Design a protein around this ligand. Structure first.
Ligand SMILES: O=C(O)c1ccc(NC(=O)[C@H](CC2CCCC2)n2cnc(C(F)(F)F)c2)nc1
Ligand SMILES: OC[C@H]1O[C@H](O)[C@H](O)[C@@H](O)[C@@H]1O
Ligand code: NA
Length: 451
């Protein structure tokens, strides 16, 4: 029961008024883009690097060649909820072997020793499954966190992001932490030859297929980008010849107040309840670690206004992280019959009407569309800066992308591409989705590094 088309209609109208707060006009996006570009300039310069919210970290991945190595390379990938080990065969590359491991909650939030001991145990497990513990292979490490590099194989962790909190890691050489754990176990040997961000590994894997790929982007649990900067603009590294990949760490844009006028009550609540309050604010508008949670908080506001579920939220709806980001993708994948929406909501202990289902869809669309538009201003800022630094009338460029939000959300991609295009006149941008990018890229970079 609960009919009346006129009253259902009035509830939808009040919902729209609340949802309108998520809207960003073209001018707001150009403003965000200009502010991002301003922060990127600040991050690159010696004079402002320490204060810059957007770190623009030199990765020591350079335009080459070189001296390419053939054969077997091991890739490690840490930075999601899962840890991946991959064996890559490079000839003249093919993902020959792969294993994913779930990281225990106690290892992400315990000590660095526990985390790296777990990683070492997973490497032993992989080597045994393929009978190769005795072979000492070159190892590429994709490590998806902000790192201050001294070289391709040496870098310090600046700070954990995305809920990681292992003590004794920040301020230490990450390659050293990995090497020390392998040594404490003592049942295999590996030569760690490179450590790269996941944006970087993604870019490298896509570049291998297409040489116009000089930008890497992640829109997964977190959100970040890297790009090939001119060495003359990389003031933190001596030399003006060629190019070097720069890990923007754009997720931290807004940490100095640059997004203040766009932050909503839901954003403040997500931030305050996160593992890193006041940090990674731009990432908190886009990343899959936060998207579902933003939707959950919007639904609770609509419940509070007596506009959804008869003003009654279930225990599950009032549970932190219960509205998963994958539910946002599934709700927006609904064909019109409301079946997928009904199922998600019924499993959350709710008894939704048809109107409740439509309202949940609009809340999802509002959060994910805003995520798409904010992300577009960041990518457009990077590409426009590249066009300018390369003094190109028309810049043709390829962007390699990975991450479950970009890949799996039914409309994020389309909304994001349309907005990027509007903000990048005189740019011809090709987007390529990476196939095992944050794994193959680390082995490929190791093949270039090993000799
Ligand atoms: O050890 C070092 O100091 C070191 C190691 C590796 C490196 N550069 C590369 O790997 C480049 C990276 C691309 C990415 C986009 C333009 C250059 N590469 C060039 N070809 C590839 C490949 F994937 F296709 F093989 C990769 N720079 C320094
Ligand atoms: O995984 C995507 C991104 O997540 C977070 O923003 C990390 O700080 C960054 O290093 C990574 O690239
Ligand atoms: Na330089």
């Amino acid at each position: 029961h609960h009919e009346n088309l006129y009253f259902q209609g009035m509830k939808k109208e009040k919902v729209e008024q609340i949802l309108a707060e998520f809207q960003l006009q073209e001018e707001d996006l150009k403003k965000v883009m200009r502010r991002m570009q301003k922060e990127m300039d600040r991050g690159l310069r010696l004079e402002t690097h320490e204060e810059a919210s957007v770190k623009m970290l030199p990765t020591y991945v350079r335009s080459t060649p070189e001296g390419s190595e053939v054969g077997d390379f091991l890739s490690l990938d840490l930075g999601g909820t899962n840890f991946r080990v991959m064996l890559v065969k490079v000839g003249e590359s093919v993902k020959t072997k792969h294993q994913m491991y779930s990281i225990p909650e106690d290892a992400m939030t315990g000590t660095a020793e526990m985390l790296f001991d777990y990683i070492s145990e997973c490497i032993s497990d992989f080597l045994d499954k393929h009978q190769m513990k005795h072979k000492k292979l070159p190892l590429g490490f994709t490590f998806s966190f902000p790192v201050r590099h001294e070289d391709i194989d040496k870098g310090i962790l600046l700070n954990w992001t995305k809920g990681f909190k292992a003590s004794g890691a920040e301020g230490n050489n990450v390659v050293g932490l990995l090497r020390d754990a392998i040594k404490r176990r003592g049942d295999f040997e590996m030569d760690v030859v490179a450590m790269v961000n996941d944006t970087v590994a993604t870019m490298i894997s896509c570049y291998y297929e297409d040489h116009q790929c000089e930008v890497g982007m992640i829109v997964g649990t977190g959100c970040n980008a890297c790009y090939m900067e001119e060495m003359q603009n990389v003031e933190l590294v001596e030399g003006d010849e060629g190019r070097m990949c720069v890990n923007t760490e754009w997720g931290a844009f807004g940490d100095s107040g640059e997004l203040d006028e766009f932050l909503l009550e839901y954003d403040r609540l997500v931030d305050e309840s996160s593992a890193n309050p006041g940090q990674q604010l731009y990432e908190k508008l886009i990343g899959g670690k936060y998207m579902g949670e933003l939707v959950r908080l919007v639904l609770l506001r609509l419940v509070d206004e007596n506009l959804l579920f008869h003003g009654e939220a279930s225990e599950q709806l009032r549970t932190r992280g219960a509205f998963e980001t994958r539910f946002v993708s599934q709700v927006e994948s609904d064909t019109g019959d409301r079946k997928q929406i009904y199922n998600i909501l019924s499993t959350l202990g709710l008894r939704p009407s048809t109107t409740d289902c439509d309202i949940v869809r609009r809340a999802c669309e509002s959060v994910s569309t805003r995520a798409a538009h904010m992300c577009s201003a960041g990518l457009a800022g990077v590409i426009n800066r590249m066009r300018e630094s390369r003094s190109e009338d028309v810049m043709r460029i390829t962007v390699g992308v990975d991450g479950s939000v970009y890949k799996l959300h039914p409309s994020f991609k389309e909304r994001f591409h349309a907005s990027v295009r509007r903000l990048t006149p005189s740019c011809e941008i090709t987007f390529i989705e990476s196939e095992e990018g944050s794994g193959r890229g680390a082995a490929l970079v190791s093949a270039v590094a090993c000799k």
